[PDB]
Design a protein around this ligand. Structure first.
Ligand SMILES: [Mg+2]
Ligand SMILES: [Mg+2]
Ligand SMILES: [Mg+2]
Ligand SMILES: [Mg+2]
Lengths: 472, 472, 472, 472
């Protein structure tokens, strides 16, 4: 049972708008909106949305497998060895937010300070002492973006596994000789970094020039979560404010996915006439190019919605009914909707491109969608005994070598419950980089944006005040 | 009574190394080491130091006044108007860590997200609604370092006040016409940004080509805190590990200041022979150029200690007794002392150049000295009733317009207790940028590095584990 | 009769290797190698070649028309107006080496100092006084590559004409309103600069993703000049030195074009067995990425000649029989062939990418192919009376208003003999930028590289010594 | 007899404005204006001047010796060895325009294409074969400004000699061990590049913070050429156009030098009242920061001429009588004087900063002052037999080993007549980089700007038309 199975289960449930039932529904962690910084919903004038893995959650592991398979085939068609075709996507290996080190070919799970929490070369997990040969301080400078690539999105799950597959394959195939920084086969040297670049290239290609989109759109029920409660939440948002879409995808893919997401024999609730997806938005903007969108952006263009092509020239007109924008910048949205940043709640899944950058560059309020949180919550409650235990050993240790080895033993047993790369949010008692960025930049977060439906629209989301150590 | 008065009071006290007295001395917040992240002192192999405002704490307000007066005189000598000479430094105005906005000429106190906490144009404090003309979202992008200058060090206290003085002067002198971005006097236009640059230039000049150093060294007792407990702590550090100095100052100024700091008729404790300051360090490095020091650094040079000049050429030799280094990089220290970053506790006062950058670029452990914390602690306890009260109003509000105006009333009354720009760490219930960077990058912090003397050298500094909202 | 008609006429002639006939053949300017700097052919160890418009000269105007037509269709398919389809390529308009000014939408012919020789907005030729509104000093800074694009290659001939077509079309179509920097149609503004970028984009697309290559290769006799004397010259070069190919084109296109260029029922001369084109080269390198090739280059790869794909990884082996390289740099050629720059004669048509950059960055000897020189020579002799006349008027003027207007009259009449944009090399008595770069960077130049066949291979090409004015 | 001796001889001669005497005076090459491109003097509306080595020609070798001696002393005071004090400036060694190679420590004389004409390591002249170890192609990429420094100005003459001195000293002093890229003395390594940087630093320091200016101004007759014909030429220029000064020097040095240059008991001619130097200029601009001046420039400031300090703020007013500008840009001059670039004749000595950059960036007409041309002309006529001979050997060679060795023999004998580094303009029959830049960017050139006095102010300076090889 995958995380998208939990989300699809909640999606099949109709909305009971009885206020008592609503309060009791955000009872369960699965349906709750979690709060990092207080947010007064009556001060929110505009609700903005990302599409992919926000409004349109791709089913797991079917969609990752599709991307993995088409990426492998692209690599084989440009000349990678045939044995790649016998790989098969395995969802229990990759955790999101890992760092690939293009120098040594390792996948790393790190904390906010770049300390190593897990190191895996292929499928071989390097333990503390052996990592010191390559990482003398058990630390990487995360901001060295020329060496380290952070696999931040659910789109990166297939290549996370594929990178491990490839390193494992070349390490153990006798045609190749392993070196510190890559593999040699006679007079051809393949560095982990050029191997990495071919994988990124092939993933991009499959999304943009290959057949991934076509195969998605040809079987949307297999690949995309559908929820009748989405029209309801959007129409309620429109009753108190403005609603906009700002997505990196192009207009033709956006129209196909969105049409499907609203494809019900009714509108906002059963019994009402169905309405086109565009009628739920005061502003629709595609080809956003986030995060650049939150700085200088690009030239504001206008989509010809009959053809799906951009009209020629820069659009200099006003907001008008029916218009669909391409490019522009976050200032386009503020001007056209008459909003200041703190009036805006932007809802997305990209911790960097949607959340970090809109917060830091523009002062937008932020809501981070974490689709895996559905399952992570299940594991966290179910095996809370393991963590509760672990908490106590570190306090026993505070007040010796026999303790530490069981610290490492239950850390391992706790982490294995999530997958081979452990929880998205921690390794034992150590929080990941990803968890720390959630806390720092996501004002609100939840397994699904739909959890906002279970809150009255004047609700004050409350977080506790932070105190420095000396202020306690 | 200034913050340096508190530190000078503690400095006059001899050390009682009775273990029971030591534990009871770190009783008081003034003498405590505060913990953001746990640190096991037995794992620390090297203790490293900054000099200025770390080992050598300049007395306040005498030293700020000296810098203010010499900066004003430099500005007048290059042609600023004579009325500047009637300014006098006023320590109750500036709080450290303010942002000067070179576009509109405002001093701003902001939180970690660049939201405005205080806005002052000259000595005129702009309240919420009027700030929206210039800051529509009550927010600045802190990383726009071309527009915003963060006044992060105690060296910036005089220019913080001077900037306010100048803006106030030109605003109210009838020879000048105020515009949005500066002042015009006939055919000469002075922008706030070029005004700002002249102030930075003049401060630099006074430190490097003017008479500030000479006047400091000519009356060290007037300007520099001296503490007989410093030799004692350093010699105890040398018993368990290595000790190094890495300072941006040059060798001649370093030798004059350090000689004074050790100028007692005894060595580590009363009764012992006095020893030169250099004997307390396994490695001495000047002209460090931090934070560049924590990246590529500069060429490693060797000081000729008889002349105070650099020897010609790059030093390629080994660490040897008596040698004094200039330039180099943090890797110089790791190689020469045989250390990894997490073996090192670096002790300094520059939140960016000493602490943030050594943590992020190198994984060093960090100890931040905050000299004002002496007084900030006094105010915080004394008027805790105000804050305790404020805490309760926000909870009353959580469960209306009459409440909010008293929220703003006690925020004001609390803040005025610290100075006109409020506490270094907060404005009411909102933490400053500076406070948030302390928590994020300073593993330990204290009013003085000397507070380490009151802890056994196997002490485990303990911080509580962090939990995400959904993990609670 | 086009310039490629002259070249095709000379190509149909078999070689008479009788030494007396050879000397009398380089009699005629059409068959001569012209000398800017002396070059001793016995000191040349390596002859290197470009392919497109050097070994493979595309027939004019058929090939330009094909490129024009496919570029127009691409523009229409992305949304430019239908009227574009009624354009037809006109070879009498464009001269090579014009500068497009993306700010004002003008085609400009300039001298070496950026002085205006001709200015055309669409098909409207702006005369001196009116150009001063937009060019106050009748001058452009050529190196402002963000504003000015120099149309340096014969590949740019179709877009040179197309740019003029488009500006003319939008200027005179009543649906659009002309502004200084572009055209507006209601709420869409098209700047000349974005119009320019769409044209560049469409030309690139047609060459790399469209059908230009396919349609070329499907009718090579229609589009490519073929000359039985090419195998002969290459085999003679191989008798005294080494021969290499370094081309920006990929391997599959290179193999198709080169196979055709050698497709004769004989080898070097009639009666000899035919040999594959690859046997004429000691080193074959594709995907050169010149001019970057003459600096850092790119990673050296190896072509799989059976599949036309690159082998995976960097090629680290030696030069070996049969190998085909991709990428690398000019140093690859020097190392693998054991050559220094002055040992190398590089033969190409790109005045910047082949000639200027190999000379300045590497000290290579250079031979510039100028296909239009065939016709330019014909016009220059035929109407030498006009130029001879013009020469005399400027001397009459040296020793008044009545003279100047006839100066401008015969300048016009001379220039019209070449085309609407005049000679490649001059406008009246003023040399173009292009002519000055030929003289400065092309050691040798000729209508065709084949003219080297008419010179013994110890020939000393001789240029006169240059004297400064004061040395005369 | 130095080149400044020739100029001082011509300067002592009073002006005979008899038109017949004027024509017969520009008879002699010493007094002629040489023409690279035709220039019609009646089209010149503004004459602009540089000061140093243009209006104010420093006497040779006295001034170079002064700069050499103060530079050596600065190097010794920062720690270079005492033996430097026994160096003495030797004017027969350095020729202007040499390239210092910071990697290998060689002085190089190169042509326009970066081919080696002379290579000297210290005082050791490397002949052809041995240079190939370090320069395999006998060529340098001149534009690699990180490795190569071109010593373009007469200010660089002392450091040209000093660099050779130092390399020679360290090579032959037994305390130091020579390596490929520098010198080692135990544990200190001095690279030629850091040695080079210390020399540049010391030259800058001596001009800007040392005592060079003071010692110049204290004995102007010893150091500066004075010519009573300068007021006369400037006043005649003012009769037909506008005159401006644009100099990099500051106002106080400019006023001292200019006052001296006009210090005669008369004005423009004997018998007329003396006038202040400022009255000869319609526009005076100091701190020009050329060549940046010809691009974005700097902020336009106004000099307070009573104090010599800049007024505070940007000057936004109009041109007015008495005003002195600081900074700004070339556009300041065009706007304030109502001129277009081709209306302007700019007169200076810096081939890059004055001539190349004003021509290429702005289309100004250019007049290059070459003070050494006085002596170079003398040598060129006197020993024309050597060159005339050399010309004939290369023609004998064109139509063998015995010839070449005498080619090299007379090249050497010709070059030695100029100095150890040969003529500024050539080595034998090969023109230098400097000569080629004179021809390309200096429309006019002369030993002194004063030679313009011998031409009527409607004179058409005439250069011959350039023809490409195929046009002959
Ligand atoms: Mg998304
Ligand atoms: Mg400090
Ligand atoms: Mg070509
Ligand atoms: Mg000068």
């Amino acid at each position: 049972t995958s995380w998208s199975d939990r989300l699809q289960n909640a999606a099949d449930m109709p909305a009971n708008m009885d206020k008592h039932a609503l309060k009791k529904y955000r009872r369960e962690a699965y349906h709750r909106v979690f709060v990092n910084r207080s947010l007064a919903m009556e001060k929110i004038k505009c609700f903005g949305f990302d599409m992919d893995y926000t409004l349109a959650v791709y089913k797991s592991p079917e969609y990752e497998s599709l991307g993995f398979e088409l990426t492998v085939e692209r690599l084989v068609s440009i000349g990678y060895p045939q044995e790649l075709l016998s790989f098969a996507y395995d969802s229990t290996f990759p955790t999101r937010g890992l760092v690939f080190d293009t120098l040594y070919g390792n996948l790393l799970k790190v904390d906010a300070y770049g300390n190593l929490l897990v190191c895996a070369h292929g499928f071989n997990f390097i333990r503390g002492p052996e990592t010191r040969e390559q990482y003398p301080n058990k630390f990487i400078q995360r901001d060295d973006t020329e060496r380290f690539y952070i696999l931040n999105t659910l789109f990166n799950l297939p290549e996370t596994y594929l990178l491990a597959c490839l390193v494992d394959f070349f390490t153990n195939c006798p045609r190749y000789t392993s070196c510190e920084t890559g593999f040699k086969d006679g007079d051809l040297f393949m560095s982990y970094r050029s191997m990495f670049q071919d994988v990124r290239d092939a993933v991009d290609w499959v999304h943009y020039k290959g057949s991934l989109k076509e195969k998605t759109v040809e079987n949307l029920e297999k690949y995309v979560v559908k929820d009748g409660k989405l029209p309801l939440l959007l129409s309620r948002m429109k009753e108190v404010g403005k609603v906009f879409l700002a997505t990196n995808s192009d207009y033709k893919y956006t129209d196909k996915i969105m049409t499907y997401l609203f494809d019900f024999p009714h509108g906002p609730k059963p019994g009402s006439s169905h309405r086109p997806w565009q009628s739920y938005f005061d502003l629709i903007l595609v080809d956003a190019r986030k995060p650049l969108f939150f700085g200088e952006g690009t030239v504001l263009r206008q989509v010809d919605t009959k053809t799906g092509k951009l009209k020629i020239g820069t659009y200099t007109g006003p907001l008008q009914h029916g218009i669909v924008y391409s490019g522009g910048s976050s200032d386009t949205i503020c001007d056209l909707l008459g909003a200041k940043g703190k009036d805006i709640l932007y809802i997305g899944d990209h911790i960097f491109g949607d959340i970090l950058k809109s917060k830091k560059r523009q002062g937008w309020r932020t809501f981070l969608v974490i689709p895996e949180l559905a399952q992570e919550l299940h594991v966290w409650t179910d095996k809370s005994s393991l963590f509760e235990e672990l908490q106590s050993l570190d306090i026993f240790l505070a007040e010796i070598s026999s303790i530490q080895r069981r610290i490492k033993k239950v850390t391992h047993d706790m982490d294995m419950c999530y997958g081979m790369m452990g929880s998205l949010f921690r390794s034992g008692s150590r929080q990941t980089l990803f968890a720390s960025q959630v806390m720092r930049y996501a004002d609100l977060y939840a397994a699904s944006f739909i959890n906002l439906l279970y809150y009255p629209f004047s609700y004050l989301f409350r977080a506790a005040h932070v105190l420095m150590p000396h202020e306690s």
